[PDB]
Structure formats: C-alpha cells, structure tokens
Amino acid sequence: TKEGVLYVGSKTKEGVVHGVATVAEKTKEQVTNVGGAVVTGVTAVAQKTVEGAGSIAAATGFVKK
Amino acid sequence: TKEGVLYVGSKTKEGVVHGVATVAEKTKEQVTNVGGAVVTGVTAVAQKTVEGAGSIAAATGFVKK
Amino acid sequence: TKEGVLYVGSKTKEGVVHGVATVAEKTKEQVTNVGGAVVTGVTAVAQKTVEGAGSIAAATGFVKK
Amino acid sequence: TKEGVLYVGSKTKEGVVHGVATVAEKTKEQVTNVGGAVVTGVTAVAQKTVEGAGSIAAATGFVKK
Amino acid sequence: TKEGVLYVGSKTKEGVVHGVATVAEKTKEQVTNVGGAVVTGVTAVAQKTVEGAGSIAAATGFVKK
Amino acid sequence: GVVAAATKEGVLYVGSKTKEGVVHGVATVAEKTKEQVTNVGGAVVTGVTAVAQKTVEGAGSIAAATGFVKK
Amino acid sequence: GVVAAATKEGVLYVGSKTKEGVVHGVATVAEKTKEQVTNVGGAVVTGVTAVAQKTVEGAGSIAAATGFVKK
Amino acid sequence: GVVAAATKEGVLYVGSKTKEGVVHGVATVAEKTKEQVTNVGGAVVTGVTAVAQKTVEGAGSIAAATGFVKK
Amino acid sequence: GVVAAATKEGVLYVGSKTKEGVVHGVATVAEKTKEQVTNVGGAVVTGVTAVAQKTVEGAGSIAAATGFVKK
Amino acid sequence: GVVAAATKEGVLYVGSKTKEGVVHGVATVAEKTKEQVTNVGGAVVTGVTAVAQKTVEGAGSIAAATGFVKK
C-alpha cells in the first residue's frame, strides 16, 4: 500500500542552525564546497535520496594548479 | 495506494537559521559554493531527492589555475 | 504493505546545529568539500539513501598540482 | 508486510551538533572532504543506505602532486 | 512479515556531537577524508548499510606524489 | 541638607518575561576632569521591569541623595 | 548632611523568565582626572527585573548616598 | 554625614529562570587619575532578577554610601 | 560619617534555574593612578538572581560604605 | 567613621539549578599605581544566585566597608 510515506513531527523551543559558515583571513586559493544532497537542522530527515537509476548526487571541490 | 506522501508537523518557538554565511578578509581567490540539493533549517526534511533516472544534483567549486 | 515508511518524532528544547564551519587564516590552497548525502542535526535520520541501481552519492575533494 | 519501516522517537533537552569543523592556520595544500553517506547528530539513524545494485557511496579526498 | 523494520527510541538530556573536527597549523599537504557510510551521534544506529549486490561504500584518502 | 523629624497590605506581584535585557545602572566617564561628583543613590530602582512599592514608608524617615562640590 | 530623627503584609511575589541578561550595576571610567568621586549607594536595586518593596520602612531611618568633593 | 536617631509578614517568593546571565556589579577603570574615589555600598542589590524587600526596616537605622575627596 | 543612634515573618523562597552565569562582583583596573580608592561594601548583593530581604532590620544598626581620599 | 549605638521567622528556602557558573568575587588589576586601595567587605554576597536575608539584624550592629587614602 504505502511506498515512501514519511511522517516528521518536530516540536522545538529554540532552534539555531548554521548551514555553511566560512571564515577566511589572509588566505589565498581556497574552496569551500557544500552540496549534493545535504540536510542540516535540528530535525534533519532524508528519505529515498539518490533514488534514480543512474543518478548522481555529488559535491566536488578542488584546486587544480 | 500512497506513494511519496509526506507529513511535516513543526512547532517551534524561536527558530534562527543561517543558510550560507561567508566572511573573507584580506583574502585572494576563494570559492564558497553551496547548492545541488541543500535543505537547511530547524526542521529540514528531504524526500525522493534526485529521483530522475539520469539526474544529477551536484555542487562543484574549484579554483583552476 | 508498507515499503519505505518513516516516522520521525523529535521533541527538543534547545537545538544548536552547525553544518559546515570553515576557519582559515594565513592559509594557501585548501579544499573543504562536504556533500553527497549528508544529514546533520539533533535528530538526523536517513532512509534508503543511494537506492538507485547505478547511483552514486559522493564527495570528492582534492588539490591537483 | 512491512519492508523498510523506520520509527525514530527522539526527545532531547539540549542538542549541540557540529557536522564538519575545519580550522587551518599557516597551512598549505590541505583537503578536508566529508561526504558519501554521513549521518551526524544526537540521534543519528541510517537505514538501507547504499541499497542500489551497483551503487557507490564514497568520499574521496587527495592531494595529487 | 517484517523485513528491515527499525525502532529507535532516544531520550537524552544534553547531547554534544562533533562529527568531523580538523585543526592544522603550519602544515603542508594533508588529507582528512571522512565518508562512505558514517553514523555519528549519541544514539547512532545503522541497519542494512551496503545492501546492494555490487555496492561500494568507501572512504579513500591519499597523497599521491 | 534635609531633615525629616516626625487583610492585605503591602502585597506586590511581579511577573516579568523578557528575551533581551541590557541594563547599565550607573555609567560614568571622566576625561581631563578636575573636581567631579557623580552621586546616585537614595532609593534607585533601575531595570527592565523596575517596580518600587512603599519606598520611604517610615514615620520620619529619609531617602536622599546628596552630591556636591563645596569649595 | 541629612538627619531623620523621629493577615498579609509585606508579601512579595516575583516571577522572572529571561533569555539574555547583561547588567552593569556601576561602571566608572576615569582618564586624566584629578579629584573625582563616584558614589552609588543608599538602597540601589538594579537589574533586569529590579523589584524593591518597603525600602526605608523604619521609624526614623535613612537610605542615603552622599558624595562630594570638599576642598 | 547622616544621622538617623529615632499572619504573614515579610514573606518573599522569587522564581527566576534565565538562560544567559552576565552581571558586573562594580567595574572601575582608572587611567592617569590622581585622586579618585569609587564608593558603591549601603544596600546595593544588582542582578538579573534583583529583588529587595524591607531594606532598612530598622527603627533608627541607616543604609548609606558616603564617598568623598576632602582636601 | 554616619550615626544611627536609636505566624510567618521573614520567610524567603528562592527558585533559580539558569544556564549561563557570569558574575563579576567587583572589578578594578588601575593604570598610572596615584591616589585611588575603590570601596564596595555595606550590604551588597550581586548576582544573577540577587535577592535581599530585611537588610538592615536592626533597631539602631548601620549598613554603610565609606570611601574617601582625605588629604 | 560610622557609629551605630542603640511560628516561622527567618526561614529561607533556596533552590538553584545552573549549568555554567563563572564568578569573580573581587578582581583587582594595578599597573604603575602609587597609592591605591581596593576594599570590598561588610556583608557582600556575590554569586549566580546570591540570596541575603536579615543581613544586619542586630540591635546596634554595623555592616560597613571603609576604604580610604588618608594623606
């Protein structure tokens, strides 16, 4: 019957979330890469992520030199 | 019957969310890349993300030099 | 009957989450890569991630030089 | 009947989570790669991750030189 | 009847989790790679991870030089 | 110079709910100052709520602040 | 110079719920200052809630702050 | 200079719930200062809640702060 | 200089629940200062909750702070 | 210089629940300072909760802090 049903009940009082925080000082070539399939938070739920047959969920960071 | 049904019940009192925060001082070449499929917050829920057959959810950051 | 049903009941009072925090000072070539399938938070749940047949959930960071 | 059903009941009072924290000072080529299938948090649950037939959940970091 | 059913009941009062923490000072080529299938937290549960037939859950870090 | 010579009662209910509170009771800055007097007293009630009831209330009592430069 | 000569009662209920509290009762800064007086007293109630009840309340009592530069 | 000469009662209920509390009762900074006086006393109640009840309350009693530079 | 001459009662209930508490009762900084006096006393109640009840309460009693530079 | 001359009672209930407590009762810093006096006394109650009840309470009693530079 049910196929991929999700119930999320969240009851918080004080929720402080910082997804991506980057601090750079006196810095040269620098990569901060965040992505693909990222769930961040007091109540973080992920279901059936990357469900495609040839699907790609990626995060690629680099410094080619 | 149900296929991909999502119930999200959130009850917060004080929710502070900072998705992407970037601080750079005296900095040269620098990449802050965030994306693809990113869910951020006190109640963060993701369902059936990247469900396509050849679908791509990506975050690519780089410094080519 | 049920195939891939998820119940998430979260009841917090003070939830502080820092997904990705990067601090760099007097730094040269540097990569901070976070991604693919990342769940972060006081209540972090992941179900049927990377369920595709030839699916790829990856995080690649590097410094090619 | 049930195949892949997950119940997550979390009841916290003070939840502090730091997913990825990177501190670099006076540093040269350096890679901090986190990803693939990462679940982080006071209540971290993972079910049927990497369930695809030829699926790959990976985190590759390197310094090619 | 049931095949892959998971019940996770967590009741904490103060949960502090640090997934990945990297500190580097006066450091040259250095790789910190964390990933594949990583569950971190006060209540960390993993079920049927790497269930695919030819599935790979890996974390590869290296310094090729 | 001041001279004073000479069922329910005095019941006080206070309910205070505040998020942010920044209170500076007394703040003094002096710069190249010669003869300065900052006198803050008597019965001073300073605060985000700041309730005062029956302050002096005495038969021949005093609540005073006396600041001066006598020269 | 001051001279004073000369069922329920005095019941106080206080309920305070605050997230942030920053209180500086007395703060003094002096710079190249010669004869300075900062006097803060008597009955000073400083605070985010700051309730005062029946402060002096005495028959011939005093709550005073006396600051001066006598020269 | 000050001279004073001369069922339920005095019941106090305090309920305080605070997350953050930063209190500086008395803070003094001096720089190249010659004759400075910082006097903070008497009956000083400083704090995030800061309740004071029946402070002086005496028949011929005193709550005083006296600061000065006599020269 | 100050001279004073001259069922339930005095029941106090305090309930305090705080996460963070930073209290600096008295903080003094001096730099190239010659004749400085920092006097903090009498009956000083400093704190995140900071409740004071029946402070002086005596028949001919004193709660004083006296700071000075007599020169 | 100060001169004073001259069922339930005095019941105190304190309940304190705190996670973090940082208390600096008295902190003094001196730098190139010649004649400095830091006097902190009498009846000083400093703390995250900091409850004081019936402080002086005596018939002819004193709670004083006296700091000075007499020169």
XYZ file of C-alpha atoms in Angstrom:
680
model
C 0.000 0.000 0.000
C 2.257 2.778 1.281
C 5.574 3.158 -0.501
C 7.673 6.129 0.531
C 5.480 7.787 3.157
C 7.200 9.979 5.708
C 5.886 11.450 8.937
C 8.026 14.147 10.568
C 6.787 15.596 13.841
C 9.147 18.196 15.284
C 8.497 20.257 18.414
C 11.352 22.517 19.373
C 11.657 25.536 21.644
C 14.902 27.186 20.487
C 16.439 26.035 17.220
C 19.632 27.667 15.953
C 21.008 26.288 12.680
C 24.093 27.399 10.740
C 24.168 25.577 7.412
C 27.510 26.705 5.974
C 29.821 29.171 7.725
C 33.092 30.184 6.070
C 35.708 32.444 7.668
C 38.910 33.193 5.745
C 41.525 35.781 6.611
C 44.872 36.398 4.861
C 44.030 33.323 2.794
C 44.859 32.577 -0.866
C 43.232 29.942 -3.154
C 40.615 28.196 -1.045
C 37.459 26.230 -1.877
C 34.532 25.593 0.449
C 32.067 23.431 -1.477
C 28.944 22.058 0.161
C 26.138 20.401 -1.793
C 24.840 17.289 -3.475
C 22.199 16.136 -1.019
C 22.729 17.911 2.312
C 20.103 18.091 5.061
C 21.033 20.219 8.073
C 18.937 21.186 11.052
C 17.608 20.350 14.496
C 15.353 17.762 12.872
C 17.049 16.542 9.682
C 15.365 13.748 7.764
C 16.282 12.317 4.359
C 14.301 9.587 2.591
C 14.917 7.899 -0.776
C 17.631 10.343 -1.719
C 19.550 9.420 -4.910
C 16.780 7.043 -5.986
C 17.320 7.432 -9.739
C 18.824 4.528 -11.651
C 21.946 6.328 -12.856
C 21.514 9.357 -10.674
C 24.443 11.176 -9.127
C 24.377 13.366 -6.014
C 27.846 14.777 -5.588
C 29.953 17.540 -4.126
C 33.244 18.163 -5.844
C 35.677 20.751 -4.610
C 39.249 21.110 -5.810
C 42.152 23.414 -6.602
C 43.634 22.440 -9.968
C 47.027 24.083 -10.435
C -2.068 3.476 -2.555
C 0.154 6.257 -1.222
C 3.489 6.676 -2.960
C 5.556 9.652 -1.877
C 3.319 11.270 0.739
C 4.993 13.450 3.330
C 3.632 14.883 6.556
C 5.732 17.579 8.238
C 4.444 18.990 11.509
C 6.769 21.593 13.003
C 6.066 23.620 16.144
C 8.893 25.890 17.159
C 9.151 28.890 19.460
C 12.397 30.573 18.358
C 13.981 29.463 15.099
C 17.178 31.128 13.885
C 18.602 29.789 10.616
C 21.704 30.940 8.725
C 21.830 29.149 5.381
C 25.182 30.313 3.994
C 27.453 32.779 5.796
C 30.737 33.829 4.189
C 33.319 36.093 5.839
C 36.537 36.881 3.962
C 39.123 39.479 4.883
C 42.486 40.135 3.179
C 41.691 37.073 1.073
C 42.570 36.367 -2.583
C 40.988 33.742 -4.914
C 38.360 31.959 -2.852
C 35.226 29.979 -3.741
C 32.277 29.300 -1.456
C 29.851 27.140 -3.431
C 26.717 25.729 -1.844
C 23.946 24.071 -3.847
C 22.691 20.967 -5.571
C 20.029 19.773 -3.159
C 20.506 21.520 0.193
C 17.846 21.657 2.914
C 18.725 23.763 5.956
C 16.587 24.688 8.918
C 15.222 23.812 12.338
C 13.005 21.223 10.663
C 14.748 20.044 7.482
C 13.107 17.257 5.519
C 14.074 15.863 2.113
C 12.133 13.136 0.296
C 12.801 11.484 -3.079
C 15.509 13.955 -3.967
C 17.473 13.075 -7.143
C 14.733 10.689 -8.275
C 15.315 11.117 -12.016
C 16.863 8.241 -13.937
C 19.987 10.073 -15.088
C 19.506 13.078 -12.882
C 22.404 14.904 -11.285
C 22.286 17.065 -8.153
C 25.739 18.495 -7.672
C 27.809 21.258 -6.159
C 31.116 21.920 -7.832
C 33.516 24.513 -6.546
C 37.099 24.908 -7.699
C 39.996 27.239 -8.435
C 41.524 26.307 -11.791
C 44.911 27.978 -12.202
C 2.075 -3.467 2.562
C 4.365 -0.693 3.790
C 7.664 -0.353 1.966
C 9.796 2.613 2.944
C 7.645 4.311 5.581
C 9.411 6.514 8.091
C 8.147 8.023 11.321
C 10.324 10.720 12.902
C 9.135 12.208 16.176
C 11.531 14.805 17.567
C 10.932 16.899 20.685
C 13.813 19.147 21.590
C 14.167 22.184 23.827
C 17.409 23.801 22.617
C 18.898 22.610 19.343
C 22.087 24.208 18.022
C 23.414 22.789 14.746
C 26.483 23.861 12.760
C 26.505 22.008 9.448
C 29.838 23.100 7.960
C 32.186 25.565 9.660
C 35.444 26.540 7.956
C 38.095 28.796 9.501
C 41.278 29.505 7.534
C 43.921 32.083 8.345
C 47.251 32.660 6.548
C 46.363 29.572 4.520
C 47.143 28.787 0.858
C 45.470 26.142 -1.386
C 42.868 24.434 0.771
C 39.687 22.482 -0.006
C 36.785 21.887 2.361
C 34.282 19.725 0.485
C 31.169 18.389 2.172
C 28.328 16.734 0.268
C 26.990 13.616 -1.369
C 24.370 12.504 1.129
C 24.953 14.306 4.436
C 22.361 14.529 7.215
C 23.342 16.678 10.196
C 21.288 17.687 13.191
C 19.996 16.892 16.658
C 17.703 14.305 15.085
C 19.353 13.043 11.886
C 17.627 10.245 10.014
C 18.492 8.776 6.613
C 16.471 6.044 4.893
C 17.035 4.321 1.534
C 19.754 6.737 0.537
C 21.628 5.771 -2.668
C 18.829 3.404 -3.690
C 19.327 3.755 -7.451
C 20.788 0.823 -9.355
C 23.908 2.590 -10.614
C 23.522 5.641 -8.454
C 26.482 7.455 -6.960
C 26.469 9.673 -3.867
C 29.952 11.064 -3.495
C 32.095 13.825 -2.084
C 35.370 14.409 -3.848
C 37.835 16.991 -2.667
C 41.395 17.314 -3.912
C 44.304 19.591 -4.760
C 45.738 18.576 -8.135
C 49.137 20.191 -8.657
C 4.156 -6.924 5.131
C 6.481 -4.155 6.306
C 9.759 -3.855 4.439
C 11.923 -0.895 5.365
C 9.815 0.841 8.012
C 11.627 3.055 10.480
C 10.412 4.603 13.711
C 12.627 7.298 15.240
C 11.487 8.825 18.515
C 13.918 11.418 19.852
C 13.371 13.544 22.957
C 16.278 15.780 23.807
C 16.680 18.836 26.012
C 19.917 20.419 24.748
C 21.359 19.187 21.468
C 24.543 20.751 20.094
C 25.821 19.292 16.815
C 28.874 20.325 14.783
C 28.842 18.441 11.488
C 32.165 19.496 9.950
C 34.549 21.960 11.599
C 37.794 22.897 9.848
C 40.478 25.148 11.340
C 43.642 25.817 9.329
C 46.312 28.383 10.083
C 49.624 28.921 8.242
C 48.691 25.821 6.253
C 49.422 24.997 2.589
C 47.703 22.343 0.390
C 45.115 20.673 2.594
C 41.913 18.737 1.873
C 39.035 18.184 4.280
C 36.495 16.022 2.454
C 33.393 14.723 4.191
C 30.518 13.070 2.336
C 29.139 9.948 0.744
C 26.542 8.876 3.283
C 27.177 10.704 6.566
C 24.621 10.972 9.374
C 25.651 13.141 12.324
C 23.642 14.191 15.333
C 22.385 13.438 18.822
C 20.056 10.852 17.302
C 21.658 9.550 14.094
C 19.890 6.746 12.270
C 20.705 5.240 8.871
C 18.644 2.507 7.202
C 19.156 0.749 3.852
C 21.880 3.137 2.800
C 23.708 2.129 -0.418
C 20.881 -0.228 -1.384
C 21.336 0.085 -5.154
C 22.754 -2.874 -7.048
C 25.871 -1.141 -8.361
C 25.532 1.933 -6.224
C 28.521 3.739 -4.783
C 28.561 5.986 -1.711
C 32.058 7.355 -1.393
C 34.237 10.114 -0.033
C 37.494 10.659 -1.841
C 39.991 13.235 -0.714
C 43.537 13.521 -2.006
C 46.452 15.770 -2.909
C 47.838 14.714 -6.290
C 51.241 16.300 -6.869
C 6.244 -10.372 7.707
C 8.602 -7.608 8.829
C 11.859 -7.349 6.920
C 14.054 -4.396 7.792
C 11.991 -2.620 10.448
C 13.848 -0.397 12.874
C 12.683 1.189 16.104
C 14.934 3.883 17.582
C 13.844 5.448 20.856
C 16.308 8.035 22.140
C 15.813 10.194 25.232
C 18.746 12.418 26.026
C 19.196 15.490 28.198
C 22.429 17.038 26.880
C 23.822 15.766 23.594
C 27.000 17.295 22.168
C 28.228 15.798 18.888
C 31.263 16.790 16.810
C 31.180 14.877 13.533
C 34.490 15.894 11.945
C 36.911 18.357 13.543
C 40.141 19.255 11.745
C 42.858 21.501 13.184
C 46.002 22.129 11.128
C 48.700 24.684 11.827
C 51.992 25.181 9.942
C 51.014 22.070 7.993
C 51.694 21.206 4.328
C 49.931 18.545 2.175
C 47.359 16.914 4.424
C 44.135 14.993 3.760
C 41.283 14.483 6.207
C 38.705 12.322 4.431
C 35.616 11.061 6.218
C 32.708 9.411 4.412
C 31.288 6.283 2.865
C 28.714 5.253 5.445
C 29.401 7.108 8.703
C 26.880 7.418 11.540
C 27.963 9.607 14.456
C 25.995 10.699 17.480
C 24.777 9.986 20.990
C 22.411 7.403 19.522
C 23.966 6.060 16.307
C 22.157 3.252 14.530
C 22.921 1.710 11.137
C 20.821 -1.024 9.517
C 21.280 -2.816 6.178
C 24.007 -0.457 5.072
C 25.790 -1.507 1.841
C 22.935 -3.854 0.930
C 23.346 -3.578 -2.847
C 24.722 -6.564 -4.731
C 27.834 -4.865 -6.096
C 27.542 -1.769 -3.985
C 30.561 0.029 -2.596
C 30.654 2.304 0.454
C 34.163 3.651 0.717
C 36.377 6.407 2.025
C 39.616 6.913 0.173
C 42.144 9.481 1.246
C 45.677 9.731 -0.090
C 48.596 11.951 -1.049
C 49.933 10.854 -4.437
C 53.340 12.412 -5.070
C 20.821 69.205 53.977
C 17.418 67.677 54.623
C 15.796 66.879 57.981
C 12.653 64.792 58.307
C 11.883 64.976 62.043
C 8.417 63.485 62.703
C -6.265 41.861 55.473
C -3.818 42.533 52.610
C -1.413 45.450 52.821
C 1.904 45.893 51.026
C 1.381 42.923 48.728
C 3.272 43.037 45.445
C 3.000 40.658 42.488
C 5.554 40.933 39.684
C 5.641 38.805 36.560
C 8.414 39.579 34.086
C 9.138 37.740 30.836
C 11.872 39.276 28.714
C 14.116 37.994 25.938
C 16.900 40.584 25.904
C 17.965 42.634 28.876
C 20.798 45.144 28.873
C 20.879 47.354 31.959
C 23.528 49.900 32.890
C 22.601 51.150 36.337
C 25.273 53.837 36.660
C 27.841 54.640 33.975
C 30.406 57.408 34.449
C 33.040 58.646 32.007
C 35.608 61.267 33.007
C 38.238 62.839 30.809
C 40.590 65.638 31.845
C 38.094 66.459 34.587
C 39.161 68.145 37.790
C 36.507 68.158 40.521
C 33.636 65.917 39.545
C 30.997 64.249 41.649
C 28.602 61.578 40.442
C 26.254 60.555 43.246
C 23.470 58.060 42.522
C 21.563 56.753 45.491
C 18.739 57.171 47.917
C 16.321 54.547 46.673
C 17.105 53.987 42.994
C 15.317 51.118 41.253
C 16.613 50.708 37.718
C 15.739 47.825 35.467
C 13.732 46.417 32.626
C 10.779 45.945 34.971
C 11.751 48.258 37.858
C 8.920 48.114 40.392
C 9.091 50.125 43.629
C 6.476 49.929 46.392
C 6.285 51.823 49.701
C 9.723 53.301 49.249
C 10.125 55.583 52.247
C 7.166 54.406 54.305
C 8.751 55.457 57.590
C 7.345 57.864 60.145
C 10.230 60.319 59.993
C 12.499 58.588 57.527
C 14.586 59.835 54.603
C 15.567 58.580 51.155
C 18.090 61.111 49.890
C 20.953 61.606 47.517
C 23.276 64.487 48.275
C 26.078 65.287 45.897
C 28.085 68.461 45.846
C 31.378 70.238 45.367
C 31.871 72.534 48.341
C 34.875 74.755 47.727
C 24.020 66.083 55.645
C 20.614 64.585 56.345
C 19.027 63.829 59.729
C 15.875 61.767 60.112
C 15.151 61.991 63.855
C 11.683 60.530 64.570
C -3.233 38.945 57.716
C -0.818 39.573 54.819
C 1.611 42.474 54.974
C 4.908 42.878 53.136
C 4.337 39.891 50.871
C 6.189 39.962 47.565
C 5.866 37.557 44.633
C 8.388 37.789 41.796
C 8.421 35.631 38.692
C 11.170 36.363 36.178
C 11.843 34.490 32.937
C 14.562 35.987 30.767
C 16.763 34.664 27.976
C 19.565 37.234 27.886
C 20.679 39.304 30.826
C 23.529 41.794 30.766
C 23.662 44.031 33.829
C 26.339 46.567 34.706
C 25.462 47.855 38.152
C 28.157 50.526 38.418
C 30.698 51.287 35.695
C 33.287 54.041 36.112
C 35.901 55.238 33.627
C 38.498 57.850 34.572
C 41.112 59.384 32.329
C 43.496 62.175 33.310
C 41.039 63.039 36.074
C 42.155 64.746 39.249
C 39.534 64.803 42.011
C 36.638 62.574 41.090
C 34.012 60.943 43.242
C 31.584 58.278 42.087
C 29.263 57.298 44.930
C 26.454 54.815 44.261
C 24.573 53.548 47.265
C 21.782 54.009 49.721
C 19.332 51.391 48.530
C 20.067 50.791 44.847
C 18.238 47.918 43.154
C 19.489 47.468 39.608
C 18.568 44.571 37.395
C 16.517 43.151 34.591
C 13.590 42.721 36.975
C 14.612 45.053 39.829
C 11.811 44.952 42.399
C 12.035 46.992 45.614
C 9.452 46.839 48.410
C 9.315 48.765 51.703
C 12.756 50.214 51.197
C 13.210 52.521 54.168
C 10.267 51.383 56.273
C 11.899 52.453 59.528
C 10.541 54.893 62.078
C 13.441 57.327 61.868
C 15.668 55.557 59.391
C 17.728 56.763 56.431
C 18.659 55.469 52.984
C 21.185 57.971 51.666
C 24.022 58.424 49.252
C 26.374 61.295 49.957
C 29.152 62.055 47.538
C 31.179 65.213 47.434
C 34.479 66.963 46.899
C 35.024 69.284 49.846
C 38.036 71.477 49.175
C 27.217 62.954 57.302
C 23.809 61.486 58.057
C 22.258 60.772 61.467
C 19.096 58.736 61.907
C 18.419 59.000 65.655
C 14.950 57.569 66.426
C -0.196 36.027 59.951
C 2.189 36.612 57.019
C 4.640 39.498 57.118
C 7.917 39.861 55.237
C 7.299 36.857 53.007
C 9.111 36.885 49.678
C 8.735 34.456 46.773
C 11.225 34.644 43.904
C 11.206 32.458 40.819
C 13.930 33.148 38.266
C 14.550 31.241 35.035
C 17.253 32.699 32.819
C 19.411 31.334 30.015
C 22.229 33.884 29.866
C 23.393 35.972 32.774
C 26.259 38.442 32.656
C 26.445 40.706 35.697
C 29.150 43.231 36.518
C 28.323 44.556 39.962
C 31.039 47.212 40.171
C 33.552 47.929 37.411
C 36.165 50.669 37.772
C 38.757 51.825 35.245
C 41.383 54.427 36.135
C 43.981 55.922 33.847
C 46.396 58.706 34.773
C 43.977 59.611 37.558
C 45.144 61.340 40.703
C 42.557 61.441 43.496
C 39.634 59.223 42.631
C 37.024 57.631 44.828
C 34.564 54.972 43.728
C 32.270 54.034 46.606
C 29.436 51.566 45.994
C 27.583 50.340 49.033
C 24.825 50.842 51.517
C 22.343 48.230 50.380
C 23.029 47.592 46.695
C 21.160 44.717 45.050
C 22.365 44.225 41.494
C 21.397 41.314 39.319
C 19.303 39.883 36.553
C 16.402 39.495 38.976
C 17.475 41.846 41.796
C 14.705 41.788 44.399
C 14.981 43.856 47.593
C 12.430 43.747 50.420
C 12.346 45.704 53.698
C 15.791 47.124 53.136
C 16.297 49.455 56.081
C 13.372 48.357 58.231
C 15.050 49.445 61.456
C 13.740 51.918 64.000
C 16.654 54.329 63.733
C 18.838 52.522 61.245
C 20.871 53.686 58.250
C 21.751 52.354 54.803
C 24.278 54.826 53.432
C 27.089 55.237 50.981
C 29.469 58.098 51.631
C 32.223 58.816 49.172
C 34.271 61.959 49.015
C 37.576 63.681 48.424
C 38.172 66.024 51.342
C 41.190 68.190 50.616
C 30.412 59.818 58.950
C 27.004 58.381 59.760
C 25.488 57.709 63.194
C 22.319 55.700 63.690
C 21.689 56.002 67.444
C 18.219 54.603 68.269
C 2.848 33.108 62.176
C 5.202 33.650 59.210
C 7.674 36.520 59.253
C 10.930 36.843 57.330
C 10.265 33.823 55.135
C 12.037 33.807 51.784
C 11.610 31.355 48.907
C 14.065 31.499 46.006
C 13.994 29.285 42.943
C 16.692 29.933 40.350
C 17.260 27.991 37.130
C 19.946 29.410 34.869
C 22.061 28.005 32.051
C 24.895 30.533 31.846
C 26.107 32.640 34.720
C 28.989 35.089 34.546
C 29.227 37.380 37.563
C 31.959 39.893 38.328
C 31.183 41.255 41.768
C 33.919 43.893 41.921
C 36.404 44.568 39.124
C 39.039 47.293 39.429
C 41.608 48.407 36.860
C 44.263 50.998 37.694
C 46.843 52.454 35.361
C 49.288 55.229 36.233
C 46.910 56.177 39.039
C 48.126 57.927 42.153
C 45.574 58.071 44.975
C 42.626 55.867 44.166
C 40.031 54.313 46.409
C 37.540 51.661 45.363
C 35.275 50.766 48.277
C 32.416 48.311 47.722
C 30.592 47.127 50.794
C 27.867 47.671 53.307
C 25.353 45.066 52.224
C 25.991 44.389 48.536
C 24.083 41.512 46.940
C 25.241 40.980 43.375
C 24.228 38.055 41.238
C 22.091 36.614 38.511
C 19.216 36.269 40.972
C 20.339 38.638 43.757
C 17.599 38.623 46.394
C 17.929 40.718 49.564
C 15.412 40.652 52.423
C 15.380 42.640 55.684
C 18.828 44.031 55.067
C 19.386 46.385 57.984
C 16.479 45.327 60.180
C 18.204 46.433 63.375
C 16.942 48.939 65.910
C 19.868 51.327 65.586
C 22.010 49.481 63.090
C 24.015 50.604 60.060
C 24.844 49.234 56.615
C 27.371 51.676 55.191
C 30.154 52.045 52.703
C 32.562 54.894 53.297
C 35.291 55.570 50.798
C 37.359 58.698 50.588
C 40.668 60.391 49.942
C 41.316 62.757 52.831
C 44.339 64.895 52.048
C 33.605 56.675 60.588
C 30.197 55.269 61.451
C 28.719 54.640 64.910
C 25.541 52.657 65.463
C 24.958 52.998 69.221
C 21.490 51.631 70.101
C 5.899 30.189 64.391
C 8.220 30.687 61.392
C 10.712 33.540 61.380
C 13.948 33.823 59.414
C 13.235 30.787 57.255
C 14.966 30.729 53.884
C 14.488 28.253 51.035
C 16.909 28.354 48.104
C 16.787 26.112 45.062
C 19.456 26.717 42.431
C 19.973 24.743 39.223
C 22.641 26.122 36.916
C 24.712 24.676 34.086
C 27.560 27.183 33.824
C 28.822 29.307 36.664
C 31.719 31.734 36.432
C 32.008 34.051 39.425
C 34.766 36.552 40.134
C 34.041 37.951 43.571
C 36.797 40.571 43.666
C 39.253 41.202 40.834
C 41.910 43.911 41.081
C 44.456 44.984 38.473
C 47.139 47.565 39.251
C 49.700 48.981 36.873
C 52.174 51.746 37.690
C 49.836 52.737 40.515
C 51.102 54.506 43.599
C 48.585 54.694 46.449
C 45.612 52.503 45.697
C 43.034 50.988 47.985
C 40.512 48.344 46.993
C 38.277 47.492 49.942
C 35.394 45.052 49.444
C 33.599 43.908 52.548
C 30.909 44.495 55.088
C 28.364 41.898 54.060
C 28.953 41.183 50.371
C 27.006 38.305 48.825
C 28.117 37.731 45.250
C 27.058 34.795 43.154
C 24.879 33.343 40.466
C 22.032 33.041 42.964
C 23.204 35.428 45.713
C 20.497 35.456 48.383
C 20.879 37.578 51.530
C 18.396 37.556 54.419
C 18.417 39.573 57.661
C 21.866 40.934 56.991
C 22.476 43.312 59.879
C 19.589 42.294 62.118
C 21.359 43.417 65.282
C 20.145 45.955 67.810
C 23.083 48.319 67.429
C 25.183 46.435 64.923
C 27.158 47.516 61.860
C 27.937 46.110 58.418
C 30.462 48.520 56.941
C 33.219 48.847 54.417
C 35.653 51.685 54.956
C 38.356 52.319 52.419
C 40.443 55.431 52.155
C 43.755 57.094 51.453
C 44.454 59.481 54.312
C 47.483 61.591 53.474
